[PDB]
Amino acid sequence: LLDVEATLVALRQQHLDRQCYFGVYVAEGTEDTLDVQMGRFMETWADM
Amino acid sequence: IDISSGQYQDRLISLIALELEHRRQNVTSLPIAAVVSIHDSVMLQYER
Secondary structure, three states: OOOHHHHHHHHOOOOOOOOOOOOOOOOOOOOOOHHHHHHHHHHHHHHO | OOOOOOHHHHHHHHHHHHHHHHHHOOOOOOOOHHHHHHHHHHHHHHOO
16 A cells, blocks of 8 residues: 555656646635626636 | 614715825825726626
């Protein structure tokens, strides 16, 4: 069950290349009303 | 019963606060771009 760490550290030596990265981890919120946040999210998803 | 009598009082208090802030301070730390940005969509989202 814990032997996957050795495989992970062995495969981490060689990587690949890719484009169009996703939104990685959680970013920082604007701390505002939900309407403007959801509008910005939907417009960014539409145009990006 | 409803709260629709203090609208004028709130408006005049807000106007006095804004005018005294303009006379004494210069905004700076007060966020002025975020409110305009959110209102830009609020105006077309809440009234329709």
